[PDB]
């Protein structure tokens, strides 16, 4: 199909952007802004905790993952309340889960406050992961355009 463009992505993510059905596996403090191994270690800890909680009758919270130029919003499915919100410039890393096509996570937070959010997607995680890649790419693209913009101004 048609290759993506900056303009297509700006239209896709502006305003309310897009959203996906998911469940929150958990949230973990992590030492670094980025890293595959760190992210997977955190995913495995949180999945272990979720399995323990599930053996005691608990359930993962049902959520919407909302992706827009405003960043990521975690929204409670039942109430519609925004539980968590991170702007684009406070999300540092997107992790795939090599054990689970229906899981992914992201590291977010300012310095010294890195946290891994582990998400169990209702469908395949990949489209959501690709949306995050595209979101970051188009914001980066636009900013570098308006930088080359100003180096030519003088």
């Amino acid at each position: 199909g048609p290759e993506k463009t900056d303009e297509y992505l700006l239209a896709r993510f502006k305003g309310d952007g897009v959203k996906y059905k998911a469940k929150l596996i958990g949230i973990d403090d992590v030492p670094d802004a980025r890293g595959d191994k760190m992210s997977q270690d955190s995913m495995m800890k949180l999945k272990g905790m979720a399995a323990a909680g599930r053996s005691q009758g608990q359930h993962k919270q049902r959520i919407w993952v909302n992706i827009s130029l405003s960043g990521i919003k975690i929204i409670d499915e039942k109430t519609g309340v925004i539980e968590h919100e991170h702007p684009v410039n406070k999300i540092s890393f997107i992790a795939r889960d090599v054990t689970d096509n229906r899981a992914f996570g992201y590291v977010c937070g300012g310095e010294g406050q890195h946290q891994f959010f582990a998400i169990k997607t209702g469908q395949q995680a990949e489209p959501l992961v690709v949306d995050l890649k595209d979101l970051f790419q188009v914001i980066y693209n636009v900013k570098k355009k308006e930088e080359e913009k100003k180096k030519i101004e003088e």
Partner: peptide
Amino acid sequence: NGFDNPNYQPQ
């Protein structure tokens, strides 16, 4: 298999 956000600002 993950990727960085080039727009990340820690401070």
